[PDB]
Ligand binder design. Structure first.
Ligand SMILES: Cc1cc(O)c2c(c1)C(=O)c1cc(O)cc(O)c1C2=O
Ligand SMILES: [Cl-]
Ligand SMILES: [Cl-]
Length: 328
């Protein structure tokens, strides 16, 4: 069978916690007053929720209300508990309240207001300096949640809300987040296609926080090379082929051989043989101002097949790429 794997950091954080911290299924939700909130405008709808601009009429402040679609009671308490555990953390969206919507008959999460502008709307027009700046802000959120025993599992531009005027960033949509427990096998049907790590694409279930670091790498590659998305697969199989055309097939086989994983035989007719490409191949006159030796080294250390070999969030924050960013 497959060889087991463990996170190399924050491995045992949940094993030492009281049950109450990670046992989300036992969580007793504390309900506020739906009457406090007036819905203003529908901002978005996904498979799991509809999101609204609203106002809290008890203090006149703007808020965002996310009305959860019926999904699985388990997933609802999981998101709630994760949001409560992470509250006040660096660049983590703040859950202000939880109420029952009278029409949907489901929970509605109330978040402190953020500007209705996601990172996807900005990240292709940032300066070199600002790419570094906002990458560091995203890393603060990731190292915090990882240190708290939680992996986000859906890191992507749409899940980073940015207020560029105020140089402010929040990581949102914790509906796919999970608690990391060593030796646990997780669902590989997480993350969005272009941001899925190789572990997901080869069906390796014993993954960890390092999944998020692959996703972050994909974002970085897209920004510095001005290529959206960087790995542009037409489905989940072709997604792995697109990765292999950059990182090469020999290191892919080394990865799957390390963990004693077998590829879906469906790959035999599509994967081929590909050399590792040098990162300089993606540099051109229109993106070169965004590329530096430090950027390429950093990217190279995020986009590794072997999840155990990727930089952790904290190691990433130590990287020379961030030396030019002013620290508070
Ligand atoms: C179009 C859009 C605008 C937003 O402001 C949010 C979202 C979507 C959103 O999905 C979201 C999810 C979430 O878990 C917390 C949020 O604050 C949010 C949001 O704030
Ligand atoms: Cl899941
Ligand atoms: Cl980490």
């Amino acid at each position: 069978g497959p060889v087991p794997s463990r996170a190399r950091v924050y491995t045992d954080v949940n094993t030492h916690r009281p049950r109450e911290y990670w046992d989300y299924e036992s969580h007793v939700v504390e309900w506020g007053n739906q009457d406090d909130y007036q819905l203003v405008r529908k901002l978005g709808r996904g498979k799991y929720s509809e999101v609204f601009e609203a106002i809290n009429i008890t203090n006149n402040e703007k808020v965002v209300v996310k009305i959860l679609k019926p999904v699985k009671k388990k997933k609802i308490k999981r998101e709630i508990k994760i949001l409560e555990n992470l509250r006040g953390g660096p660049n983590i969206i703040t859950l202000a309240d939880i109420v029952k919507d009278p029409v949907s008959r489901t929970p509605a999460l109330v978040f402190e207001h953020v500007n209705n502008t996601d990172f996807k709307q900005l990240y292709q027009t940032l300066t070199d300096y600002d790419i570094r700046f906002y990458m560091y802000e995203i890393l603060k959120a990731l190292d915090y949640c990882h240190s708290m025993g939680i992996m986000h599992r859906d890191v992507k531009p749409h899940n980073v809300m940015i207020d560029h005027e105020h140089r402010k960033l929040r990581l949102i949509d914790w509906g796919l987040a999970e608690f990391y427990h060593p030796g646990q096998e997780y669902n590989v049907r997480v993350a969005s296609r272009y941001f899925k790590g190789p572990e997901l694409l080869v069906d390796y279930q014993m993954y960890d926080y390092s999944l998020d670091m692959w996703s972050l790498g994909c974002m970085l590659a897209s920004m510095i090379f001005r290529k959206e998305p960087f790995f542009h697969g037409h489905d989940n199989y072709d997604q792995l082929v697109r990765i292999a055309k950059v990182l090469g097939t020999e290191d892919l086989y080394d990865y799957i051989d390390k963990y004693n994983i077998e590829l879906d035989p469906r790959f035999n007719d599509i994967l081929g043989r590909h050399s590792r490409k040098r990162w300089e191949r993606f540099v051109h006159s229109e993106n070169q101002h965004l590329v530096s030796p430090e950027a390429l080294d950093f990217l190279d250390k995020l986009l590794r097949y072997d999840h155990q070999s990727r930089l952790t969030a904290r190691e990433a924050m130590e990287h020379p790429y961030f030396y030019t960013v002013v620290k508070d």
